[PDB]
């Protein structure tokens with residue numbers, strides 16, 4: 001992980017989530033459950049769908065072509081064919097083989113990036129109203145029910161609403 | 176069987192032109208000849224297979 005998401009602080013991935021690529025795990029008073037963020041997942045797929053498209057679509061330059069047609073009193077020219085034909089085969093194989101290797105590293109890192117940005121989007125909404133575990137989770141200081149948590153996902157979470165509930169829960173532990 | 180050889184030749188005759196022959200002997204003249212309208216080139220693919228009625 002370049003961004004320290006996937007290999008890093010989120011050791012392993014939720015297997016029970018099968019809605020999207022990136023998402024959340026709520027465990028409040030009503031119950032537990034996974035819930036995937038479809039909006040960020042969609043942008044990733046829009047992106048990846050476009051990479052793969054672009055690697056095929058740009059090579060549209062291809063035309064007519066042929067094989068071999070010289071007698072054994074013109075082996076010199078047949079050797080010139082071989083040099084060229086082997087030559088291109090070398091270039092295309094190399095360029096292809098590497099293109100894969102290069103675009104595969106960045107594709108994996110694009111996912112790391114999206115996950116670290118999602119974790120950061122949650123982190124910035126609830127500054128001192130929750131506790132950064134370091135396993136990439138957030139322990140709430142106040143009670144937040146199923147209707148409260150849609151606000152975190154939606155991104156409409158009010159800091160001032162639950163400010164005093166947490167702030168005065170903080171000194172209770174600090175003894 | 177036969178010891179001696181048989182060298183063939185060819186050219187393409189323009190739409191509005193005449194081919195003229197003249198021979199003392201040792202000659203093999205054409206009976207038939209072919210109409211050609213050429214457009215584009217390809218090649219002679221070397222394969223053992225036969226036609227699969229597809230595209």
Ligand SMILES: *[C@@H]1O[C@H](CO)[C@@H](O[C@@H]2O[C@H](CO)[C@@H](O)[C@H](O)[C@H]2NC(C)=O)[C@H](O)[C@H]1NC(C)=O
Nearest residue numbers: 186187188189190191192193194195196197208
């Ligand atoms: C082969 O036949 C053609 C038939 O068209 C000959 O072309 C004609 O020749 C006449 C006589 O001079 C001209 O008035 C015209 O140019 C052609 N006629 C028509 C109707 O197109 C042609 O001369 C012959 N070719 C050669 C090389 O002798």
